[PDB]
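2024-03-11 09:14:02 INFO receiving multi-entity request
2024-03-11 09:14:02 INFO entity count = two
2024-03-11 09:14:03 INFO echoing inputs for audit
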Amino acid sequence: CNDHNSAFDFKLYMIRKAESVNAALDVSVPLREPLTVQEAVRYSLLAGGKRVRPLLCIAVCELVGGDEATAMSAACAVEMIHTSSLIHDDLPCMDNADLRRGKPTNHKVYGEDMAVLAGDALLALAFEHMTVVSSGLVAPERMIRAVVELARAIGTTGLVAGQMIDLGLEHLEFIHLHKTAALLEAAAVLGVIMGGGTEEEIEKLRKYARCIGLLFQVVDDILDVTKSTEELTYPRLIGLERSKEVAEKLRREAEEQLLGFDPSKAAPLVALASYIAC
Amino acid sequence: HNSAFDFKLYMIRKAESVNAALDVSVPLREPVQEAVRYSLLAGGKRVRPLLCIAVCELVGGDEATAMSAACAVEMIHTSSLIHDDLPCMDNADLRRGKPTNHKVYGEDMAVLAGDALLALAFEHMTVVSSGLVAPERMIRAVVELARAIGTTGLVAGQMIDLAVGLEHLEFIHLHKTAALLEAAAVLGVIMGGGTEEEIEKLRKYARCIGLLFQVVDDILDVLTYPRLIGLERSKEVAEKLRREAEEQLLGFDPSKAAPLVALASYIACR
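2024-03-11 09:21:47 INFO inference complete, emitting structure
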């Protein structure tokens, strides 16, 4: 984790993509009347984010030869779903967070009822937004495949199952595979689909995204024991040293999925794995 | 007279094939499903999946072809019931004499179960129907379902309901009741191979029917129609809604139209 030129480039990449994503999200949920609805939806959606999921979607679409523009509504859709899951996670019945990124959580602003409902609205808006924009830009069979992939990433085979179970090691990887990886996989596969890429590229980048998600969760535990005096985790299941080994194996596994792609087009995803691992 | 009894039998038949399909759609065999099935298979009138099927048949389609869309609109209906029962909203301990979802599984599981049903509606409808219909229709079906649920659909209705009269009330009823019925009907026309012009007619029918339901419910009960516009004008609104619904059924064979005429009647004469 040493090459600073690619890190500088990627830092700039992140800022630019996040800016583009924030503009498109702002436009995706217009401040139109009835404000009661739109405001509660917008509050959590337009709060500051690293936007790694829509960024991954965009980067993958570019990798296989596509444009940011073409990938943007799918990218926004995955950020909407991710936002919905955060709203419900923060709820008193679940995590009971007062704060999110330093700012009051949704239910703390609008009430619990409104927060539940806002989560529901965001789930529906993802499918609507993605389909209504993307259907004009890709073959209808691809559009249908995109809808299926999104829906599957959300459900009993994806995000919701992972949330429910989160209430030995194989269990921890189950949680991480479902809460984090499924929606990242969705983001990457939607990237390939929106970029006109092949079935092979779809599975390669699905694998890439799975590695990236797992890597994020391992590195999160490492960072916590490494920087919280209080600190079920990887360093307490298999040690801190082996935890770092696992992180590094995951990162190299992600990187190998990008072999044979155009170096230039591959650079942001190489750098994304490096950024996460360090 | 007898025609209403025929419709009763019709509803019972369609409901039982919908219940079968719903059972199959959330396979109990796990690795979550239990919380979902508990509310989804609890039993209802299944009026929205019936509307979907009846409308598919109307335009010359099959029950089998519309069944996944019908199940999807029932999953969405079921989702909104689970979320409505929650402590933070209607705080109901019971539903049809039976404990509500959060009372069996906890509020967190209930919330999650609602979210799962929302995703499963899209996955199930799209995987099965795509399937049986041209891809452009499938796409349009996804857009209609999505539009019925959110900020211009059911959730908008719920949010505004949490809060002088007629504009507000019509908004709530149109979004909280009508939007999803409209989805059921339009999905019926789409899966049935019907035309755009049949779509608009049946969207209109579903709308009249949903509104009719709420107006008649307010009339039976003597922020309502009779207090905002009077009892007399409420009965007038009910009658023109009923008849508006029937006029959408012009141009179809009487026999195929019969269950939708009968459903309009059944909502009118409660």
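2024-03-11 09:21:48 INFO post-check: Chain A has one domain: 1-278.
2024-03-11 09:21:48 INFO post-check: Chain A touches chain B through 49 residues (CB under 8 Å).
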